[PDB]
Design a protein around this motif. Structure first.
Motif, short mmCIF file in Angstrom:
data_model
loop_
_atom_site.label_atom_id
_atom_site.label_comp_id
_atom_site.label_asym_id
_atom_site.label_seq_id
_atom_site.Cartn_x
_atom_site.Cartn_y
_atom_site.Cartn_z
N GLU A 4 -11.69 14.98 8.70
CA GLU A 4 -10.56 15.32 9.54
C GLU A 4 -10.31 14.26 10.61
N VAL A 5 -11.38 13.74 11.22
CA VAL A 5 -11.23 12.66 12.20
C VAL A 5 -10.65 11.42 11.53
N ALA A 6 -11.19 11.05 10.37
CA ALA A 6 -10.67 9.89 9.65
C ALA A 6 -9.21 10.10 9.24
N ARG A 7 -8.84 11.32 8.84
CA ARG A 7 -7.46 11.62 8.48
C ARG A 7 -6.52 11.39 9.66
N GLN A 8 -6.91 11.84 10.85
CA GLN A 8 -6.12 11.52 12.04
C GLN A 8 -5.87 10.03 12.13
N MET A 9 -6.90 9.22 11.87
CA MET A 9 -6.74 7.78 11.90
C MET A 9 -5.82 7.30 10.78
N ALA B 74 -10.24 9.55 3.14
CA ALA B 74 -9.17 9.75 4.11
C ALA B 74 -8.17 8.61 4.09
N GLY B 75 -8.59 7.43 3.63
CA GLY B 75 -7.66 6.33 3.49
C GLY B 75 -8.06 5.04 4.19
N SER B 76 -9.33 4.89 4.57
CA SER B 76 -9.77 3.62 5.12
C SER B 76 -9.57 2.51 4.08
N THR B 77 -9.35 1.29 4.57
CA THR B 77 -9.25 0.11 3.70
C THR B 77 -10.42 -0.85 3.89
N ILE C 176 1.13 -4.34 8.18
CA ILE C 176 0.06 -3.43 8.58
C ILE C 176 -0.70 -3.04 7.31
N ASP C 177 -1.90 -3.62 7.11
CA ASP C 177 -2.64 -3.35 5.88
C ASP C 177 -4.12 -3.05 6.10
N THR C 178 -4.59 -2.91 7.34
CA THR C 178 -6.02 -2.78 7.59
C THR C 178 -6.31 -1.54 8.43
N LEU C 179 -7.08 -0.61 7.86
CA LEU C 179 -7.67 0.50 8.61
C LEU C 179 -9.19 0.34 8.57
#
Ligand SMILES: Cc1ncc(COP(=O)(O)O)c(C=O)c1O
Ligand SMILES: Cc1ncc(COP(=O)(O)O)c(C=O)c1O
Length: 226
Positions: free
Chosen positions: A176-181, A212-215, A195-198
């Protein structure tokens, strides 16, 4: 064995991306080599790793110069520690990435001190998404303003976001925290260019950050020792 650990980590990254339907190629592995000796990076390099993260400026710059002089090319150095203004010049002169932009003044210093012959320093804006005990990172409500100001600095390039969530053992809270990010990352991606970097996730929360979608995950212990 560093080589064995590198291969073990990459398999875990690859599996985690595949399970949630993402291509393993979406995830960058950033080997956090802070406090480890240059000889250890040398093994990682000989095992094919190219992207390394350092938390302390002088340690990082010393390593950067070490491998430059050996004539090792193709490396990418990320500064991922907090950045004091009296060490910004070494970062601006030597690093390829900086994950820890949380105030306009440190970004403007990096811009002014970056030689023009270098590519623009790739920067992420660090969000304090969930850590009351950290004096690093901004709140999400400040992101649009900082992003717009940093976006004009010509010797920098705004690539996305980074966060170090408060330590959390519950997978549910990790996700959930990562999803917020990821949500904030996606919103920034709509208006801003390239914008391509999490930068999100370490050894213990790698899977939720990937789901969650980190890159880009930042892995130290699982590669080099604790
Ligand atoms: C292991 C290590 N290397 C190098 C440094 C270099 O110091 P600085 O990052 O302030 O330049 C530090 C201290 O901060 C350190 O703890
Ligand atoms: C920003 C950042 N990423 C990653 C790590 C380390 O990751 P790991 O939990 O795999 O040791 C640290 C270093 O202590 C860190 O400060």
């Amino acid at each position: 064995d560093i080589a064995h650990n590198l291969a073990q980590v990459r398999d875990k990254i690859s599996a985690a991306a595949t399970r949630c339907g993402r291509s393993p190629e979406e995830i960058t592995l950033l080997a956090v080599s802070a406090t480890k000796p240059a000889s250890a990076i040398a093994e990682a390099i000989d095992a094919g790793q190219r992207q390394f993260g350092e938390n302390y400026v002088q340690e990082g710059v010393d390593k950067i110069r070490h491998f430059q002089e050996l004539g090792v090319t193709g490396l990418e150095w990320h500064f991922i520690g907090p950045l004091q203004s009296n060490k910004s010049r070494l970062v601006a002169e030597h690093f390829d990435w900086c994950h820890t932009i949380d105030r306009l003044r440190i970004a403007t210093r990096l811009n002014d001190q970056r030689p023009a012959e270098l590519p623009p320093l790739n920067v992420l804006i660090q969000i304090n998404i969930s850590d009351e005990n950290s004096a690093s990172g901004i709140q999400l409500a400040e992101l649009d303003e900082l992003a717009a100001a940093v976006a004009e600095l010509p010797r920098l390039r705004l690539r996305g976001l980074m966060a170090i969530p408060a330590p959390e053992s519950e997978y549910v809270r990790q996700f959930e925290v990562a999803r917020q990010m990821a949500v904030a990352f996606a919103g920034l991606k709509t208006r801003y260019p390239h914008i391509d970097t999490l930068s999100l996730g370490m050894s213990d929360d790698m899977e939720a950050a990937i789901a969650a979608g980190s890159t880009m995950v930042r892995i130290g212990t699982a590669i080099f020792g604790a």
